[PDB]
Amino acid sequence: PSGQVMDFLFEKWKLYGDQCHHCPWYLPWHHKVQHRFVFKRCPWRDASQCQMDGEEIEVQKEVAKMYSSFQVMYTVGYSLSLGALLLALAILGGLSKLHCTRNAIHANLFASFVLKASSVLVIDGLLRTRYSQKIGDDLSVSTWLSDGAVAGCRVAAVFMQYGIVANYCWLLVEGLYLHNLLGLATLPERSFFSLYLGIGWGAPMLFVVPWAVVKCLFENVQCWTSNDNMGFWWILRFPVFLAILINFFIFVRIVQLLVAKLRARYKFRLAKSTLTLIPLLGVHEVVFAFVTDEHAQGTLRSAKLFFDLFLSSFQGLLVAVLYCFLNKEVQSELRRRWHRWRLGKV
């Protein structure tokens, strides 16, 4: 209901007591219950004539289970990926031989995945606590609608919005770096690592700061987590769509090059190469990209929120397994350390 329906209810009730001596109208569902009234007993007290529809309660009871299941699913998904990414970051840093530009982009991508996974859990954890406290006394909610109580949530909201956008940029940087290597014949002289780093880390920064300013002035809704105006919510999706639209053409070109390298000399390798390439470029996002937020009402909106939230949670684990823990150059270097540490004891 666009948010802050609790804010309106509290204000109207205060106005009811404001009048004093110069069913109640301040009720949210008063429009459909105007005709009925309260018994002359001398709803406030002892009134059961006007309540919500039992079918409405039955419907509202079923939608919580879907949210709980989705939350459990992605909460389980993020933790394993986070642990795997930390373990992979340790190994690349602990081996002096595996120091290259490629490994630098890989480590920077792992850091962004870790940051996003950490931010989502932190913002999820301190949001179920706000709605898990007894209302109690009437003078106990006056300090619950104030800026001091929600001071620590609007910072987490900004930190959660930055981490998601800063992760879609390193996916584009990975494609851009690989597309450039095969275009030119020789080695590419010096590496534009500074330009790639700036694009990866500082380009999100110029899309979220304009968002927060508009959020603070014109749409200062509680906790800064509900979207009401689609125009202000179009600010954070343009860079998201641009990255996947750019990365689709790079994927197509790489597959064509792979087919050319095998024709001029089968199908199993051509099917294995694309499956491992998909997690590094994110094509699962463009699969459902064109079903926008506004035009999704029934089960078409629930399937889109399941496919994308299931494939995004394990994308951090898949890249770490495919590129660090399964690499031939890593498995041949890890065994040498074992022999060095073993023979040094005999």
Binding site: P1, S2, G3, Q4, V5, M6, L9, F10, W13, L27, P28, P43, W44, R45, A47, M52, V63, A64, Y67, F70, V120, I123, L127, Y131, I135, V141, Q161, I164, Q222, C223, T225, S226, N227, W233, L236, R237, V240, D293, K304, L305, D308, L309, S312
Partner: peptide
């Protein structure tokens, strides 16, 4: 992205629950 819209829907669901709990407390006491 799907995370933002899911979080928005969850928050909007929670807000109405809190409002109805307040109404229930008001009518009970």
């Amino acid at each position: 992205h799907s995370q933002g819209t899911f979080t928005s829907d969850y928050s909007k669901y929670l807000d109405s629950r809190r409002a109805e709990d307040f109404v229930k407390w008001l009518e009970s006491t």
